Nucleic acid binder design. Sequence first.
RNA 1: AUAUAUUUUAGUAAUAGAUAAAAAUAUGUACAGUAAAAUUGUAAGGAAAACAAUAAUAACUUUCUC
RNA 2: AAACUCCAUAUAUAUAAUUUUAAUUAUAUAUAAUUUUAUAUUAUUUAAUAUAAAGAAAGGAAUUAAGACAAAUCAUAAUGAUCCUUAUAAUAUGGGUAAUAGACGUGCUAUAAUAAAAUGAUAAUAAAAUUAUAUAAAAUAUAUUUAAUUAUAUUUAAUUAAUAAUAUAAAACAUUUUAAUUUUUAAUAUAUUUUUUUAUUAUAAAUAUGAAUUAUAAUCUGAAAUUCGAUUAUAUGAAA
Lengths: 401, 80, 57, 93, 120
Amino acid sequence: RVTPGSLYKNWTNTTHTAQLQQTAVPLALPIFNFDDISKTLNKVVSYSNKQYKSLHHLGSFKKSQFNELFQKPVCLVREDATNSFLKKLVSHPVKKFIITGEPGVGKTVLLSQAHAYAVDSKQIIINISYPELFLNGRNDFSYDDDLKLFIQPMYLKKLIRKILKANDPALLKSIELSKDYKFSNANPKNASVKPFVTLNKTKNTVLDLLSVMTHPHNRGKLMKAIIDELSVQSKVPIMFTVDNFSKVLTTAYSAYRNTENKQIYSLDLQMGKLMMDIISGETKFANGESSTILAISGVDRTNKTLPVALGKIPVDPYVTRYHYEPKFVELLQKGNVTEFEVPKLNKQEVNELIDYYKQSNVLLDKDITGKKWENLIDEKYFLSGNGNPRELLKSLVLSHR
Amino acid sequence: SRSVWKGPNIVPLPIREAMTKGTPIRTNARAATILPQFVGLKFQIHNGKEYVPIEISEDMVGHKLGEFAPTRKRFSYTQT
Amino acid sequence: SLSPLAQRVVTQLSVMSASRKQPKLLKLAREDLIKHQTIEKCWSIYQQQQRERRNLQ
Amino acid sequence: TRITLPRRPAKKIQLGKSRPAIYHQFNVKMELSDGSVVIRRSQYPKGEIRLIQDQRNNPLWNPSRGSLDRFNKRYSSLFSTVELSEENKKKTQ
Amino acid sequence: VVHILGKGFKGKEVIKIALASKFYGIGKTTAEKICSKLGFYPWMRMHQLSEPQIMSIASELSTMTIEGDARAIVKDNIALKRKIGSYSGMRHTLHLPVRGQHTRNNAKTARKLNKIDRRG
RNA sequence: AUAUAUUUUAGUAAUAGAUAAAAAUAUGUACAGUAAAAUUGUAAGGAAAACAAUAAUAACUUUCUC
RNA sequence: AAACUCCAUAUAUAUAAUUUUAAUUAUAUAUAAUUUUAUAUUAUUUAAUAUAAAGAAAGGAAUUAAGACAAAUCAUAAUGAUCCUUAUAAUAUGGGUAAUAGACGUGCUAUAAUAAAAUGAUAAUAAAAUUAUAUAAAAUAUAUUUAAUUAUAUUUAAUUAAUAAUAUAAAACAUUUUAAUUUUUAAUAUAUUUUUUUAUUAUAAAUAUGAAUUAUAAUCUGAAAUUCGAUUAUAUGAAA
Ligand SMILES: Nc1nc2c(ncn2[C@@H]2O[C@H](COP(=O)(O)OP(=O)(O)O)[C@@H](O)[C@H]2O)c(=O)[nH]1
Ligand SMILES: [Mg+2]
Ligand SMILES: [Mg+2]
Ligand SMILES: [Mg+2]
Ligand SMILES: [Mg+2]
Ligand SMILES: [Mg+2]
Ligand SMILES: [Mg+2]
Ligand SMILES: [Mg+2]
Ligand SMILES: [Mg+2]
Ligand SMILES: [Mg+2]
Ligand SMILES: [Mg+2]
Ligand SMILES: [Mg+2]
Ligand SMILES: [Mg+2]
Ligand SMILES: [Mg+2]
Ligand SMILES: [Mg+2]
Ligand SMILES: [Mg+2]
Ligand SMILES: [Mg+2]
Ligand SMILES: [Mg+2]
Ligand SMILES: [Mg+2]
Ligand SMILES: [Mg+2]
């Protein structure tokens, strides 16, 4: 008893997935570029078209945000938060960050900005938004024999596709291969004719490698090969990113069960192990400017692990595996992860946001009409808990109290 | 003693004399666990009112004696 | 038409019945028939002899 | 009221044509309680059977020659005769 | 659609849960163990199963003491109870509650299905 | 081992004996046989259900044998 | 009757070497209101409405008279009369008070998505009360390959208490999941909705509700758990 047009989903899903961004005012806002941050240092800025294209593919813009409020997802540049982070990324020798903060402070937004910057500066981006998919057991998996770990060839395929599409092909096909690669063919065409697909050293490309389509049991092998290729190449920078890395840290054991009924460890998987290797000084990328940018989510569980990894708490040895996994900490220490605290909004920034919202026509009538502007701003600041952006946004729009 | 450790529930009885010569054992215990040492001994277990004659088979070995002497009469209704 | 119990009874009945379970008749050639007769007669004689031996004893 | 199988018309066996009921029978080996095997013709399809309770292990047929099991299993550490002697005072009865 | 060991299954039915629902011998833990043995990802659906996987499941079910055999064990136990002049056996025979309950009022479920031939 | 085609089987049903005192075609003819009671027993079975058993072989023929 | 009374409230004073700390408290002693004042608007100096300025100022408990109902209690206890005195008095062992056709009250749990379940350790936020016929912390072991959870066992740290324990309150709020529901899944492509979209293929009246009833195994208390107790596990999964 359902039509195509009617809304059948729950609220959060509906807001994400039903395009109510359709009925919205076009806004001629400035464009996000790191080279011209001096112009737009503390102003709202729409992303470039190319950036948007890349960012959507990656999975930067998420469901629980209020990206439905505008024509397209929008951020502002911040001197204390985003700009400083970008500068650190540019300058630091290690280039290896974990974006920490309170729930709703704007970690994902920071990640999205970092991605956009990377896109601008001719870099490949391997984004893993929501590791919950590979960590929790809701897709097929298999123990590979060559690689001593469990591969996940539904998730992997999706990730490969994202990598292919998020990045431009000219940058991606500038990379020649280091080794030759045999794979099992899995086209609808040439199934009987071509039993195997072969990629040569100099002739073939990374783009071509990505476009390969194998059976599930070779997908993990393909992924491994791709990563190796990217590590080897020194022509283009590789930005690796993992958002909701908190889940990964806490969920040490996956929901998958091996032959004997017991839970599989995250490092015994392909994806989680690979990710950990990337984080640590192990799969070292040949080029400079090649970063790993991790991000915590307030959604996920909290425990002693991440604080212990960083310069926060001394290592209590007696706390349990559930609330403190030491292997993960050790791995984090190995690859010198310098954490980045996202600061809460200043008064001026809050004011600027409120002004933008007013321009876009999100503010309620009781806020605008018959009220001093400065007083309103102060109230908004108070209700957000002194500049938590999400909370502020909620107070503005989702209050109706 | 129900729990496997510390069991069974043992009671003093005239067992050896019954074993020698078929003299039924009039139990008023009802909470003594039956043992393998008395299968094929005649017991006369109390019912509240009247002692009930039973010959202990090998299927009874785990159970209590009072489980085989049903105290209440089988219920009926006088359809008036 | 019939219950499962009725069906099972019918099956049981069939087990006992000669309906469509029995082979063709054992036909013989005349020489074969003679051979059979000689086998049977000799056997019968032997059995009689044995009976007499036992009886005599 | 009376449960029946209602008869069809009977098939006329002609005089002389009546054939004896030779039922299908297998030669079946019965191994008794001890290793003594005996062949017997049987209608059920099983070439070999071995028997547990027979005349060859019954006391009536040779005078000259699992609740309990469960109990034994779960009161094994105690080892439960001496125990009988200990728990058998014949004063009270 | 997807038949396995005689029991029919609708598609999109999560395998372990479906197994627990249908087969008499198994609950939650047993179904999970079976899935682990066979190597299905948890929350895999019944429609996703290939034919060899189905056969392997069927084999696993056959190896386990389930369905009619499991039911029979329960029946045998109650028959044994009845055989000895036991209180529990007596209760089973008379269709009253067995587990030391009250029956001045509310003993309707027991009356309905405390038989010697229990399950159905 | 498996696929298709063409067949064959499975409609599962009682008498197997010239049946002989359970019940059923009550008039013809041909062939053959003998009932009942009482008694002694035997799972439920009991005075009363079913099944078993309960007069005599002299002479004769054939067969085997001392 | 009201009032004095108690609890709770506001204020003041006292005391507490601010390690028995919670001073944001506890407890003795006061004071405080059955609130006051003024402007108006209706009805006759007052009384209800409204407005204003002054205040922390707004509840609950106990107390339920006379009579009546020959209301309830001789099973809290006691006493009158009356009856029993080897029994209607006294002790032990077991059984019963838990029986089950129908019926009647009180409750509890349910019949799923403005509602159920997993999870949430720099442990979100309470109060009141108990612990020398005790309260039992941490930690080890088993159920259970990690560990947590829950349940037992092991063994008693601390305190007979503003000091330690019972005891990290729970809803809340947040992520995840949820059949009925082809209102979803997964194979392909697809892309500026990517924890997602579109296209084409295949996905065909009690559940992944409920927890009655029963089977087996363990554990707890006790000397003893059969009639007849309480947990945990693996199955069972009515009715609704
Ligand atoms: N920094 C920043 N954050 C914003 C802006 N606009 C909205 N946000 C909010 O940033 C939030 C993302 O915070 P995040 O740290 O991912 O929350 P978490 O997932 O709970 O950790 C969203 O909820 C947005 O509402 C902006 O212009 N800048
Ligand atoms: Mg996040
Ligand atoms: Mg089941
Ligand atoms: Mg008063
Ligand atoms: Mg203080
Ligand atoms: Mg009065
Ligand atoms: Mg009266
Ligand atoms: Mg009175
Ligand atoms: Mg009196
Ligand atoms: Mg008295
Ligand atoms: Mg007395
Ligand atoms: Mg009562
Ligand atoms: Mg009441
Ligand atoms: Mg519910
Ligand atoms: Mg403890
Ligand atoms: Mg304390
Ligand atoms: Mg808590
Ligand atoms: Mg129903
Ligand atoms: Mg349930
Ligand atoms: Mg429930």
